[PDB]
Design a protein around this nucleic acid. Structure first.
Ligand code: MN
Lengths: 106, 101, 87, 105, 103, 79, 109, 99
DNA sequence: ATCAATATCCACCTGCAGATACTACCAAAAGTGTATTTGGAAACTGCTCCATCAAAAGGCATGTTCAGCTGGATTCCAGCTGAACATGCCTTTTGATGGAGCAGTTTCCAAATACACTTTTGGTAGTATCTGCAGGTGGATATTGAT
DNA sequence: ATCAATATCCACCTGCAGATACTACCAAAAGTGTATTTGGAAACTGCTCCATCAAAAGGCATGTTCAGCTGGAATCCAGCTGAACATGCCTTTTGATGGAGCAGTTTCCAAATACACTTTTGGTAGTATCTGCAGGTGGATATTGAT
């Protein structure tokens, strides 16, 4: 029986372990450590697709693409501050046009 | 007529993504580029969580990172509501792995 | 059988219409005459910047080619981290 | 009868811009042409280091990066004219957007 | 009563003179008590019943103060850009945004 | 007073060092807001460091480790 | 012991201590032999570089001993250090004396 | 007398040394000294770190002295960098020709 | 140009916050010979990937005229703000006690890990057929714009 | 307010690259199980500096009158800047050949690791003179701003 199952997750609980050793972030790795991680990583993955999935239904597409991800990420308070120095590769820009740039008073 | 001087494996999370996808949306696909973005998402969030705990330990003379450091990282590194649910989601996973065997 | 001609003044390959579109998308309305010149320079530094890191990397593990991943470090490490092209 | 300007269609100054401010925003392709933005990633390089070569896909990354930027440097620079009670971007705009960013002094 | 035209330094001059005075000096320009109060009032909401090593509070007072100072030059610059010399909050709001705070 | 504990002249004093001649009236409140944002943000991080080393006291290192990752590094206290 | 690795390189920065700090931090599996020499050297010079200008700075303001104010004035007045500390705040450092030119008496001059 | 003797090791003694090798008559206050000890720690970790990442992209594990060269090269502004690399290749060659 | 009207800047004075000079101190930090371990450097080569061609077109950038109206300059004037002056409360701080709590030290096992098998899997390769939507056409309704 | 004259939605359609799909081997990685090591909680108490007390002292803040001008608003003419319209070029495109130069596998040793063991020294901890300088005093005079 596998350490993913053992913990309930989907994100490779053994594979994140290695990368906590090969990285040399500290010397010794715990037991909760690599588990507790593959939980976060997964959750987030999960978070950002319940968004970029709906993104996709809104414009009648049905396969997620980078651009959907930009709407997702960008239309969302926290993710946005988590990804303030990130750059979504071909993920346009949230539609937006400033006020004083609109033509009126005939 | 197969295989050329064994090419090193480019081990991504492409599959662990797609698996955690179909859960959220059973009938939504994803491109390569759609995807290829998500991998570095994982990849990126890793480096930071680990690394931030790496710091926590070194400000504590700890030669080990426990899931409590990972938590402290997560709690520093993530913004509000994203923090809580991750914190909990994290423990939930530990809880289950310290209740089997 | 090799080619390679002199490479000069290619900042002009960045052209006013396109320096427009960037600025359209920007959410921008009226483009003054100068911006076209000010931006081209503004772009040089950036490239100039990301590149003398992209390379400082390649130059290192003894290579003669700058890779996708090569750039990514030169981005990230400056606070411009891109997802898509790898790592 | 002699009295009625002309007839050829002319869209007012600004209501093609909005039509475009609307459009490029919508999508996602890079607004700089490849070959010409290529020669500049070739060229700025060889000036640091000769005999060097690029990946089909590093120059494709150096784009979406140095692109993105402008369109978001410009984002910041629109904002700035608007703040001088304007609707035109003039070089001084950028230069203020750069300075405050910490790109200058 | 009457004063027979005394001395009243023309406005902005006592201001423009203070600018020179404070740039040349370096001492923390917030009364230490109300600061050490505002520090204690906020952190309580993160953890109740705490302590602050006198250095830590000043460490923060060096940071908080020095932030503001810089942020004020950015404002003034923003302001002068509207062709003004009086910093309104409409200025600050642009400086924070550009820097990426309201962003 | 606390947030009202920071004084209008002190604000004028901190602004003068920035190089400001004319200070509009609203500023004083806006600034007092700007000041709280900063502080809440720092201490939250700092306190999270305290709580890790199991302590009921914020060290001047909790603060550096906080002000560092914030993005506002402070020399003068690090040891 | 016979001769310090510091003086074996000709420095005032502990080419020994570095090598420990580099091992304790977990920067790599294996710190090379040259590594801490180089690293110490490079550090040493930069610290000479500041102090030089930090000495001069005080000598302008009629003083013998160095205060923080002598560092802050040293640093910002120099382009390449300013960038190297482009995002650092020296405690009790103060700021360089500058006033915006539009604020000068009689309109703008 | 080893109780409150948890060593708070620094660079202060080395900072003062170099202080003199250029400005022998000039002093340094404890406050300004601390800054000067914050600085060295700072500049250490960065170069150290930038070299910690530099091994890993290359799939190497040994932080040779080369790593540091680049680490600094990547890190240090224009001219102020050209000098550092030198002084650090100076000291390394001295050590290479040592007892 | 005049000259009071105040804030500024220089030499010269002395006292103490705060840097310096001396010894006793000791764990631990570092250098020194020993014996072992393997990272990475080499030389050879399979092989993906870039420079470079080539030939054909077609959207795309160039320049050009033309004129709408934004930017910039002018005068203006109302009310926000700096100045100054009067109180007068509120910070300062020193000067020093309980007493928390950081921070130190002896314990001791649960937790890491290094150790050698064993089962599994996820990635490349290979080949092979789907299927979502760019993309191109056309015809209905929306926006803009001169009457 | 129509009415023409545009782009703009939206629908239907296709063509096929880019998706998803099985077989297949399979080197590495994941897990299992043991001996073996050890980082850090567990708890006890020593003291360094944190917190409120006390209690002056006046420095520094708050409200108040006055009027100086700075911001903003209201009008007006240059000419900048977009819109459009004619052309024609260089990017784009889709493909094909070296072959440079990257990368993967085999070999071997300089250099780096763990290690037992001798020594140097940086931090501590009082203890005590030293000392540049932060504020005090003239008495100059520069900058300000009335005449
Ligand atoms: Mn060149």
């Amino acid at each position: 029986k596998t350490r993913s199952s053992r913990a309930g997750l989907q994100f490779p609980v053994g594979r994140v372990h290695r990368l906590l050793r090969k990285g040399n972030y500290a010397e010794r790795v715990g037991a909760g450590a690599p588990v507790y991680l593959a939980a976060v990583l997964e959750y987030l993955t999960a978070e950002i697709l319940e968004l970029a999935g709906n993104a996709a239904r809104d414009n009648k597409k049905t396969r997620i693409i980078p651009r959907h991800l930009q709407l997702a990420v960008r239309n969302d308070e926290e993710l946005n501050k988590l990804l303030g120095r990130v750059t979504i590769a071909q993920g346009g820009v949230l539609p937006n046009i400033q006020s004083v740039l609109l033509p009126k008073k005939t | 007529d197969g295989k050329k001087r064994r090419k090193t494996r480019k081990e991504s999370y492409a599959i662990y993504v797609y698996k955690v996808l179909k859960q959220v949306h059973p009938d939504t696909g994803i491109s390569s580029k759609a995807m290829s973005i998500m991998n570095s998402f994982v990849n990126d969030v890793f480096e930071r969580i680990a690394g931030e705990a790496s710091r926590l330990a070194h400000y504590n003379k700890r030669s080990t990172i426990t899931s409590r450091e990972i938590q402290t990282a997560v709690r520093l590194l993530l913004p509000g509501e994203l923090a809580k649910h991750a914190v909990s989601e994290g423990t939930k996973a530990v809880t289950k792995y310290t209740s089997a065997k | 059988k090799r080619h390679r001609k002199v490479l000069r003044d290619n900042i002009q390959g960045i052209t006013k219409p396109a320096i427009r579109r960037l600025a359209r998308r920007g959410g921008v309305k009226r483009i003054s005459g100068l911006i076209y010149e000010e931006t081209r320079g503004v772009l040089k530094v950036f490239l100039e910047n990301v590149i003398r890191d992209a390379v400082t990397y390649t130059e290192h593990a003894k290579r003669k080619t700058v890779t996708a991943m090569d750039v990514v470090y030169a981005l990230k490490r400056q606070g411009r981290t891109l997802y898509g092209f790898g790592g | 009868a002699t009295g009625g300007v002309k007839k050829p269609h002319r869209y007012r100054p600004g209501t093609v811009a909005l039509r475009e401010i609307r459009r490029y925003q919508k999508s996602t392709e890079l607004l700089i042409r490849k070959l010409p933005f290529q020669r500049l990633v070739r060229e700025i390089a060889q000036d640091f280091k000769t005999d060097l070569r690029f990946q089909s896909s590093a120059v494709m990354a150096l784009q979406e990066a140095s692109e993105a930027y402008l369109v978001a440097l410009f984002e910041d620079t629109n904002l700035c004219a608007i703040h001088a009670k304007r609707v035109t971007i003039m070089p001084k705009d950028i230069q203020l957007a750069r300075r405050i960013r910490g790109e200058r002094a």
